[PDB]
Write a protein that binds this ligand. Structure first.
Ligand SMILES: *[C@@H]1O[C@H](CO)[C@@H](O)[C@H](O)[C@H]1NC(C)=O
Lengths: 48, 48
């Protein structure tokens, strides 16, 4: 009723009522970086 | 070597380091704050 990864992390699960296989993907995340010049020229920034 | 280092770092999460369990939710839902904080501190020290 459960699957696991090569590092033994949960990756799938059968739905307990309708026996179908549901893949599990961790929620999206990531670092936030800002591109900016010397402030002696402007005050605009871009976010990546 | 890089893959093995990352594998060891990932596998280190399952240890309890002498605490009650390796899951924060179990400690929160099983013990009172005054010693749950001690268990959490133990886990924090190990992971650090
Ligand atoms: C940028 O402007 C500041 C004024 O607040 C000045 O002190 C600094 O020397 C300037 N930098 C350059 C590279 O001109």
């Amino acid at each position: 009723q459960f699957g696991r990864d090569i590092a033994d992390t949960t990756d799938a699960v059968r739905d307990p009522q309708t026996l179908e296989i549901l893949d599990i993907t961790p929620c999206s995340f990531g670092g936030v970086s800002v591109i900016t010049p010397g402030t002696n020229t402007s005050n605009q920034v871009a976010v990546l | 070597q890089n893959a093995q280092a990352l594998n060891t770092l990932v596998k280190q999460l399952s240890s309890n380091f002498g605490a009650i369990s390796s899951v924060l939710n179990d400690i929160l839902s099983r013990l009172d704050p005054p010693e749950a904080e001690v268990q959490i501190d133990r886990l924090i020290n190990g992971r650090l």
